[model samples]
Target: SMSVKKPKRDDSKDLALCSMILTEMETHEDAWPFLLPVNLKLVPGYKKVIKKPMDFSTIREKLSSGQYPNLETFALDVRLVFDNCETFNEDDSDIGRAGHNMRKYFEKKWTDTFK
Candidate 1:
């Protein structure tokens, strides 16, 4: 005999967690660089270099529109924000530092909330 385990899923709860994390990230000191889309005029070649652009506002829109099929996809977009930053900026640069700090914050909060 064997015990079968049912798969667990909680969409509302996961979305709420994502919203909470987004709010915290918005208020974070290092969130400026990611609050909105990068200005192509100001940040030359940004569109050319970054294949996919991800930002807080866009993520929020996606969240509200139910674009994310699951929590993992939501997390992927969130991580994309930092990945783009890491690709475009120097580790010592202001935006670069912000990206590092924000990524650290996200990882910690995500683990604490989900793990």
Candidate 2:
């Protein structure tokens, strides 16, 4: 499947919206945000199921095997992560910091998922 390119966010409104959504997701247990800027959206989906507590070996195998089919699955997985972030939170850090760590966890997961 072909990738979809994300749009460029030049306007303050767009940035504000993105920030707000992210903040809400980070701060609340019920809020889950999913928005992709215009410039970097074209990512593919993974066909293989890399189990949770994702690791590098599993990801490498899937990518090497060319198992991902499209980008929407990846996007959906990310959204799911955000949606479920509240369930994973143990500490009471502020939204921004929590969100930052959440993204970091996803980044690592993604890397490990598609290594």
Candidate 3:
């Protein structure tokens, strides 16, 4: 006679808990992919604040008068990217690191891009 193996039955209570966790993780995964790119784009605007040392009033005036054309709309695309990242996920550590590295790369791009 051949030996037969028996399958384990599902425990409803444990299954329910596992299902809930799976659902939550799925939601997180679904949102993560969308956040990374947005954050990357916003980086330039945030850096603009660092690039120019002018006061807000002067900056606003320059924007209105068109003295500094690009500065007025400068980094706007990146700002939107940052906003999207915030909307996507709050505790995404991996993406957070990537974001940090991205900014670091930008800040030091002149020196780091090739290396």
Candidate 4:
């Protein structure tokens, strides 16, 4: 006799969080401006730093393929990635403060949708 193990099922709340943020950034000007001056190279693993303002690709990749454990963890990673910018500071710097606000928005939306 053999025993079988069941694979853990993943939740789509993460994906929904991704879509909501992406759409909001596109539709609202201020929603994305803070990410513009961010220096991607200040962090690691990002290769093609572009001329455009907002880059959603990083967030997109994190939310895809079940790479992350959950939405909250993804949120933490997002904060780290944002602060990787040379000019970012979660408490004081302008860009960093905006990132914080964006993060809060993500959590609020996540809570509302999941409920």
Candidate 5:
């Protein structure tokens, strides 16, 4: 039972590896049944703005222009999201299964890409 703070990492390598992880994700079949539905409406008090769940293309544009600022922080943020997702999916509903599977892949994605 050892817990330690991680040192800072190189962004260039981290970003590159993160991108590769996403590309690998693209190769895998979506969690399916509900198409790995993001369903942002599930989030509390979220206004119905542009879309229900923005696709990768939309988010991809945000991270564009030659620099992702912090892959490590982003990965942690993603982990939080996936962790919450698994909680919601604990009921084992169909969408729950999808979220569970999505969480599994994403949890794997974080570990496999970083270390």
Candidate 6:
């Protein structure tokens, strides 16, 4: 008498969409500065200045590891990557400019694809 039907939870589509967005962001012309973590040796004060450092490589790993259970959760990390970039860089500089461009692209693609 305990038997009951379970509704399917289809998370694969969400995962695929996030993955596609990430892939395009990675290949974008302005994505170079955000592709990986900042080099602490070269930029010695980076870890000190940025409390929560984020990067595309880290996001990719988290996504693949199932850390992002929903699109909202995934979006937070994506935003963080750009936020940290701005925090540590001047908006008119190359890295900061790239962050702005990539972020705009990401948000536009996000809404177009999912929203």
The per-model lDDT (C-alpha) reads 0.93, 0.40, 0.37, 0.55, 0.52, 0.90
User: In candidate 5, what are the lDDT values of residues 14-97, reduced to their tens digit?
Assistant: 656766665554455653423233556775533343233333333244345444467755455344444544554554676556
Please report the candidate that would top lDDT against the real structure.
1
Cα lDDT tens digits for candidate 6, 79-110? 99999998989998998899899889999999
For 1-115, candidate 1 gives per-residue lDDT tens digits of 2787677555568888889999999999889999999988888889899999999999999999999998889899999999999999999999999999999999999999888
Q: Where does candidate 1 stray beyond 4 Å?
A: 1-5, 9-11
TM-score winner between 1 and 2, please give it. 1
Residues 1-115, model 3: lDDT tens digits: 2586677554334333333422332244333433322233555553433332322233234344545334214233323333434444254566554434443433353233223
Error of 3 at 22 (Å): 37
Alpha-carbon deviation at 72 in model 4, angstroms: 3.5
Better of 2 and 6 by TM-score: 6
TM-score of each: 0.90, 0.28, 0.27, 0.47, 0.53, 0.87
Which candidate wins on TM-score?
Answer: 1
| lDDT score for residue 10 of model 4 | 62
Residue 31's lDDT within candidate 6 is 92
- Per-residue accuracy of model 4 over 1-115 as CA lDDT, tens digit each: 2687687556645577666765674454445644333455674443454322334555556456666676666556555554443333446666556666676765676567665
Which 10 consecutive residues of model 3 have the lowest summed lDDT? 51-60
Task: Candidate 3: give the clashing pairs.
Answer: 38-81, 41-78, 42-78, 42-79
Clashes of each: 0, 7, 4, 0, 0, 0
Better of 3 and 6 by lDDT: 6
